[PDB]
Amino acid sequence: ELSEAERKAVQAMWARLYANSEDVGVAILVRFFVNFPSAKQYFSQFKHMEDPLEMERSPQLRKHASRVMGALNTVVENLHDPDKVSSVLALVGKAHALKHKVEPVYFKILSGVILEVVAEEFASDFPPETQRAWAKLRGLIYSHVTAAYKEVGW
C-alpha cells in the first residue's frame, strides 16, 4: 500500500489532473490510441479511426475517457480505505477481462501513456517523491487488475 506521504503525494497530484478531468482523460486516450493503434480494436465507433482530432471529438472515446478518469478518481480519493480500492479494481479488472475481452497488457501500456502525459502536463509539480508514489499507484493498479484476470481463468 501507499504510505501516508505517498498517498498525500498522489492525491495532491491527482487533484490538479482532475480540475480538468475531461480534457486530461481525453488527451491521455488520444495519445494511447495514436501510439498504440491496436488498442482501438475494442472500440466500435473508432477501430479504424486515425485522425487524432476526430478521436478528440469522438463521443465513445470521450465517454471511455470519462469512465477511466472516474474509476481512477474513486481509487485515488479512497486510497486510505484499501478494501474500496480492491473493490473498484476487481470490478474493472473482471469487466475488462470478460465483457470487453481486452488483453491485460493494454493496462500496462495505458499506464505508461498516463505517466508520459502527467510528466508533460504537470512537470513543475512532479518531484521524485511524487514520481515514486505515482509509480506505486501504477503497480497497485496493474497487480489488482492482473489478479482479477487470473481469477476468472483468462
**Chain position carrying cell 477481462:** 97
Q: Which uninterrupted H or E stretch holds 77?
A: helix 59-77
Please state, in angstroms and rounded to a whole number, the distance separating the CA atoms of residues 21 and 135: 20
Interface segment toward ligand HEM; rule CB under 6 A; list 18-26, 51-59, 64-72, 123-131: 64-72
Cβ pair 148, 31 in contact under 8 A: no
Residues 6+ apart with CB under 8 A from 8: none
Measured from the CB atom, the residue of 106 and 122 that comes closer to ligand HEM is 106
67 binding ligand HEM? (CB under 6 A): yes
Min CB(35)–ligand HEM separation in Å: 12
The Cα-based distances of 92 to 104, 129, 142 in angstroms read 11, 28, 11
Ligand-binding site membership of 80 (annotated): no
95 binding ligand HEM? (CB under 6 A): yes
Measured from the CB atom, the residue of 111 and 130 that comes closer to ligand HEM is 111
Q: Which residues bind ligand HEM (CB under 6 A)?
A: 39, 42-43, 60, 64, 67-68, 71-72, 92, 95-96, 99-100, 102, 106-107, 110
